[PDB]
Design a protein around this ligand. Structure first.
Ligand SMILES: CCCCCCCCCCCCCCCCCC(=O)OC[C@H](COP(=O)([O-])OCC(O)COP(=O)([O-])OC[C@@H](COC(=O)CCCCCCCCCCCCCCCCC)OC(=O)CCCCCCCCCCCCCCCCC)OC(=O)CCCCCCCCCCCCCCCCC
Ligand SMILES: CCCCCCCC/C=C\CCCCCCCC(=O)OC[C@H](COP(=O)(O)OCCN)OC(=O)CCCCCCC/C=C\CCCCCCCC
Ligand SMILES: CCCCCCCC/C=C\CCCCCCCC(=O)OC[C@H](COP(=O)(O)OCCN)OC(=O)CCCCCCC/C=C\CCCCCCCC
Ligand SMILES: [Ca+2]
Ligand SMILES: [Ca+2]
Ligand SMILES: [Ca+2]
Ligand SMILES: [Ca+2]
Ligand SMILES: [Ca+2]
Lengths: 265, 246, 265, 265, 265, 265, 246
């Protein structure tokens, strides 16, 4: 068709040096986007997790109410406010009557902290890891497009009709192959560098998120429900024993009292 | 503790295959094949263009050699004093081509040979080889290096002019033997060249000689109407310029 | 076989320009399907989740009955209607005695709302993510097929007999491959664009679904089972103590009663 | 090595059309196996899931025992029969003493129906997805084998050793490369067709399995354990109250009795 | 440096035939290792699972003690012995006082059998799937390395210092390329075969393990916790009325005794 | 552009032999980092797990307190110490009065030990698998990049001016292709070696961690919660029966005492 | 009922790039590179003889053009009447070289231009470029196709004879500014003879002119020593034999 003829003739005339320039510009834009949206954000997130973990470990040996207020202040002015609120809901406070007052003597965990401070919410979504694991492939695709186009241009211009212009045809073809190879090498280098950087950063992010959630888990012991069930079972048994003993004591007291009544009569 | 042990599982969606290295590899397979095909085809084409040029040179040389051989055979069939050298594309006169001091015209045998070789040249040019490769004929004069240089040049030039007359003189048998077309072809073919002084072996008898050589088209030479100068039809007879008492 | 040569001459008889147009049309149709069935629906889902989150945040201070009715009225889409019904089954209404009546004083969570407003039911099924995550691979495969088809068209017509035929065959092969590669480059660009749009959309869908479920989870406090167990343990201990106290009180009352009887007699 | 040369002359002696023919036939056999064992099977699974969902929706407003009998008679395929038996174990029947007998007044859910009518047991294992998800890679690998072996044949035939027969050698090379790319293109086309079909089928199967499990889940209400615990807590409180009231009532009755005895005296 | 030249001279000094031979031998050895450590092992595991499933299905109608002893004696394999022990711990025995002794009348399931007879412990670890799913890539890599090294040999032997040596040099280089491609083609074929066998083995293993766990699950009914909770609620509700009735009957008996005492007096 | 020419002159100013040297050196550095940070660490982890499994098997017949102290002293690595602390707080100690102080007569598991001694905690994060599983691709990519860079150096310095300059340029280009082949062969060799070692290490780590967690699970029996519920149910029924029996005994003894008082009167 | 709340769930682990596709892309890129470089090497080898011949032809052309540029610059510096055509190795004297009908002489400016250009061409040929690529100088004659052929031939021959006479006649102004070695060089490098017919010009008057045309060795000639001959020293001054008074 005429439109496709025009498209082919305009793509055939593209000057070969422009393809590697376009590839390098687009790949540099992708790399700057990677740095701004992924790497710097991941560095900030790792630092935030480290600071949170230092804060959590600093109240390890504090009173439970002091711990609760400190953690609430730590998370309240942050994007982790709701995760902390839900985790604190999962925290069961055991109360004992001291000095006529109901006071928290212990806090019990019923759930791991990672069920509230998840990798998805804390790392994957903020870093857009769903997309950025595909970026090295994206760069490789740009590279193959640019390099294949450059090689096609070079081959199309390589047309020696006589032996005497073989030298010039070789020289021009080598220039075009050099342009295509420049595009490919830049794209693939950016792909490998991006892969390295983002895998390293994601591994560090997961490591420090594990440290954060482990610091939260270290604060409060679990297993309160089994203790409650054991207490209930013990209470039922001891209540049977208590009922028997109370009946025997009541019988003995009634006997002694009626003996006293008979003596008085 | 209040959760259920019979919960949903297999919460793991399958990751999609990364496609772009696959596309890189497949397109690069296509390009590798393109470069292999271009390599074999280009090597074949360039080798065949070198061999086609070599065979063109060889065929042109063979045509030149065949034309020279058949012309020499015709010359031998006509009369036996003609000396033809196919190695340098030259036809000379062994004994009848000699000259003496202050002499400018060939002897009777020399004139007979000169008049006999013209139809042979016409036939050689008329053949397919003559059409394909034959160029115009130049005439080279030779004289000893001794004596006055200007005198020898004038003598050789006079010999050339007298030879050209004998070729085209109306009184000469050639004009009354050939036709208008043959005369025009002779005008196209025979040309006057320079004068050489290749003196060797101290033999003045053979040094002062005149012989006609033949040139040929090259492979890259182009035949065009610009070089094809067409003489007008003969409207009047031609008389030679040097008179006998000279 | 003659069948193979017949299918080859049939395949390679198509005009070279028809290969890029076929690839471009089919890639464009796939991209339009992606836009209509994935991107537009994902944008609608995100916008609706934002609206639902704003509606949920407006009843944070409402009474449990009022906000329960508000949430029931809010959720009408079939998937969210079912999710709300199941989540409400998971809510535990705590009744107290006011004015001789049993009324709800507090609604407790027994599961996170994400258990019912899950990523699958609310995002993955509506967006057909099980299919659309493999679309870029299909697009790139179609581009590869186009390039291979153009190469085959070029190779089948290659005439290496004479140098002039060699040169013309090389130009024709390169032109056919260039058409096919125009198609393939369109396919790869579309694959990159689809990858970016899909991954960004799924990340933002998950983000706003998490915001929605956080808005829901903030309305209801969990941990009611442990509180009930602690209450039962306390009740058992107090029941033992009260049994002892009531037995002693009964003994004292009997003593006073029979002292009065003795005085009267 | 004589053995390696014998192997090479054996491999390269085969007629070059037999390589793409073998690739096409094996790829077509794999495709037909995919259609028969995966695609038709998935279509049958989807149709059955739709019919089961319709049957479940037909008993929404039926009595619990009528519903239970209907669902027992409905599920008879081995995997769904087992899933139904396990799910019915997970259902909690609440009994009340009516007209001197214990009658089921309500059936309560303890687990999501998806825990038993799982995607694994009902889709992934019957469809053998653990194999078929890797079939497109196998098809592309078969195409790659065809390309490699056809290029080997083309390179083996290329030994002109004479300027006269260079054209025949180039023709044979072009033919063999054409065969190789025909096989590879067919394999890639079949791989992307298989990917399209099986991802679309798996997405639809999951969607309708979710509809089926949602229909089952809407029959029975969850949250019975927390209701039982709340009842126990209430009973313990009212038990303390009843103990004190019964003690006081017994004391009052004893007072009345002994005053009556004193009046008789 | 000169060290690079020396190692390049050393590497390219071997005969081109030894590279395909080395690739074939090493790939065949890895294939034999796959057959021994993976394929035969998976066949044995599948056959054992089928035998175990037949054994389990034959005690479906047996008494709980007989079932338990049969299952204990049946599972003699470290992984399945430990899995059976853990699963049996998960089973809850219900004792009723019959003939003056505590006898098991019913055994209840509290976990699915798949939680202990898991795919990882029974298939993945025994088959070393964490390694063998990457064997095809290793085989392809070995083939590609062989092809690169054969290309080094061929290129090093390529030295057309004369115009008349060009055709012979090209022919020898294409032969060496053929050697290298032979190695790669054998490796890719072996990789595809290994992928096919491995994925089919995983599919069949998972299917038959599902049949095994379904057989185990069908022996024991779940849901004992909710039944216990309903029983406790019923006991509390009946205990209130029992206390009231006992108090009333005690009052009536006391009234009768005091009336009789007054008449006797 | 002049920018492209300046970049090309800068990149290709390096000596050709430095590209293969750089590829080999960078690949060897990555391999050494893999050995130091992954392989040696994984060997230490596996050896430690086997030692801990032996130690745990050595305390099978020890007293619960002795086992607890031994296990507490055993785990000192940070991730191991944290896993042990969390698992221990998931362990339920059953106390009995023997005879004046609370003694641990049995320790019950409420969770699998793998819940705390998990693969993610103990292998994946310490081994940095989130990074190292992508290393072989990085190595192969560096091989490709070296190929492109060396070919750029060859192409940019091609001098067509003089026939001997042409010959030297051709020799340099051939040498550069040989260099690219060597770099790629080395890179792919290292990538497959890294894959083999890494996947074998990860499989062995999972195997021996499973053995370790199975050894921990063998120490403690699960299912205490259902036992507690069954005990509560039995106690409730027996409490009703004992209440009736105690009422009968009390009324009989009261009748006997009244008869004795009447006889004495 | 009593399910484990602390059940851990392994993270969704991004799966890596399959090694085969990147390795296969590497292999196909390497194969494309190999075919490209093999094609370059093969084409360079099959055309190396052609490339060397073309380089030699280019070098010969550059040297000849440099010699012609030096000669024309010298002519411009010395005498404006001398114009050199470097396109086809032609020395022209258009205004100075006009020949009237039936006369073989030239005006004063023509003689001055000839005797001024001869030493310049001699010193140009004496240079290394001349000593390497400069052959003898051929004198060009032009004639028309009208009238009697032999009359035009004689007119051109007399023109050439008069030209060489003017170069090498006693009492000529050139002889007063010459040495014996330069005279010998003129004798060696100059030969008189040659006629031609052309129709590339619009006027018959342009045919009445004299022109100098130097020609060079071939690439395979390389100055054969046997072709060179020797001449004896001058014993008497040369005297022209043409009729000056006419
Ligand atoms: C110098 C130029 C040279 C290079 C040119 C080519 C470049 C190619 C490179 C390829 C890959 C590089 C991209 C990497 C960066 C992406 C990182 C990321 O995840 O996003 C960060 C960020 C979102 O993440 P975030 O940081 O959490 O955002 C916070 C929010 O502000 C608020 O937070 P929130 O969570 O509440 O957010 C709510 C959410 C809810 O919204 C949603 O519903 C999201 C889900 C659906 C998204 C709907 C948007 C659809 C847009 C249609 C296409 C528009 C332009 C297409 C561009 C390509 C066409 C040539 O909204 C969004 O996040 C949507 C924002 C994204 C839209 C981007 C705006 C359009 C373009 C930007 C203009 C700036 C000029 C740059 C250059 C322009 C290109 C030449 O989005 C961006 O800013 C991305 C823009 C950067 C450049 C994008 C270029 C397009 C790439 C596609 C390749 C094209 C292939 C060739 C086409 C040929 C076809 C035949
Ligand atoms: C080490 C890089 C880390 C990761 C790399 C991943 C891919 C691996 C592959 C390949 C190619 C590497 C290029 C070669 C590096 C050598 C550096 C060097 O020696 O510099 C010295 C050089 C020459 O010194 P002389 O001895 O005076 O030379 C005289 C010659 N007559 O001068 C300098 O100081 C530095 C010059 C800078 C050159 C720029 C090259 C880039 C370097 C490293 C990154 C490679 C990425 C390749 C991507 C290509 C993008 C199109
Ligand atoms: C962003 C994409 C990511 C990766 C890219 C891969 C590489 C493919 C690309 C590109 C070629 C470079 C783009 C052109 C920039 C030039 C702009 C300019 O200043 O001038 C505009 C020009 C004036 O100069 P010309 O008339 O072209 O002079 C010709 C003399 N020989 O006129 C115009 O206004 C626009 C003309 C557009 C020309 C380029 C068209 C390329 C479009 C898309 C590229 C897609 C891949 C190519 C595959 C080809 C298969 C057949
Ligand atoms: Ca803890
Ligand atoms: Ca909440
Ligand atoms: Ca429900
Ligand atoms: Ca069961
Ligand atoms: Ca255990």
């Amino acid at each position: 068709m005429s439109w496709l003829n025009s498209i082919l003739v305009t793509l055939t005339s593209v000057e070969p040096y422009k393809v590697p320039v376009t590839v390098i510009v687009t790949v540099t834009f992708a790399f700057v986007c990677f740095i701004f949206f992924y790497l710097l954000r991941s560095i900030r997130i790792i630092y935030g997790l480290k600071k949170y973990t230092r804060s959590i470990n600093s109240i390890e040996k504090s009173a439970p109410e002091v711990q609760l207020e400190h953690l609430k202040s730590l998370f309240q002015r942050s994007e982790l406010k709701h995760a902390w609120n839900e985790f604190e809901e999962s925290l069961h406070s055991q109360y004992e009557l001291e000095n006529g007052e109901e006071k928290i003597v212990r806090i019990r965990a019923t759930a791991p902290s990672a069920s509230f401070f998840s990798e998805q919410q804390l790392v994957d979504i903020p870093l857009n890891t769903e997309f950025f694991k595909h970026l090295p492939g994206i760069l490789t695709g740009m590279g193959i497009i640019g390099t294949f186009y450059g090689l096609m241009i070079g081959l199309n211009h390589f047309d020696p009709s006589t032996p005497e212009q073989v030298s010039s045809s070789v020289n021009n073809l080598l220039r075009d192959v050099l342009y295509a190879f420049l595009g490919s090498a830049f794209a693939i280098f950016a792909s490998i560098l991006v892969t390295w950087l983002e895998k390293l950063s994601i591994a560090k992010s997961y490591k420090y998120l594990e440290k954060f959630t482990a610091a939260l888990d270290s604060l409060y012991d679990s297993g309160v429900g089994e203790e409650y069930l054991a207490s209930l079972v013990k209470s039922s048994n001891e209540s049977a024993t208590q009922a028997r003993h109370l009946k025997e004591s009541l019988v003995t007291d009634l006997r002694d009292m009626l003996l006293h009544l008979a003596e008085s009569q | 503790m209040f959760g259920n042990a019979f919960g949903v599982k297999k919460r793991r969606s399958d990751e999609a295959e990364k496609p772009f290295w696959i596309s890189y590899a497949d397109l690069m397979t296509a390009m590798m094949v393109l470069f292999l095909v271009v390599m074999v085809a280009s090597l074949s084409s360039v080798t065949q263009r070198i061999q086609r040029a070599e065979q063109g040179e060889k065929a042109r040389g063979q045509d030149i050699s065949r034309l020279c051989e058949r012309l020499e055979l015709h010359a031998r069939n006509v009369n036996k004093n003609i000396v033809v050298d196919c190695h340098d594309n030259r036809i000379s006169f062994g004994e009848a081509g000699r000259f003496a001091h202050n002499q400018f015209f060939l002897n009777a045998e020399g004139q007979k040979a000169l008049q006999d070789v013209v139809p042979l040249v016409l036939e050689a040019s008329n053949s397919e080889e003559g059409k394909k490769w034959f160029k115009q004929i130049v005439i080279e004069g030779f004289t000893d290096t001794d004596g006055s240089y200007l005198y020898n040049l004038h003598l050789s030039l006079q010999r050339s002019e007298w030879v050209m007359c004998s070729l085209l003189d109306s009184r000469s048998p050639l004009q009354k033997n050939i036709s208008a077309e043959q005369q025009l072809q002779i005008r196209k073919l025979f040309l006057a060249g320079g004068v050489s002084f290749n003196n060797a072996k101290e033999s003045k008898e053979a040094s002062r000689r005149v012989e006609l050589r033949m040139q040929f088209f090259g492979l890259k030479d182009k035949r065009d109407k610009a070089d094809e100068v067409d003489f007008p039809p003969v409207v009047n007879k031609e008389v030679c310029q040097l008179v006998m008492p000279l």
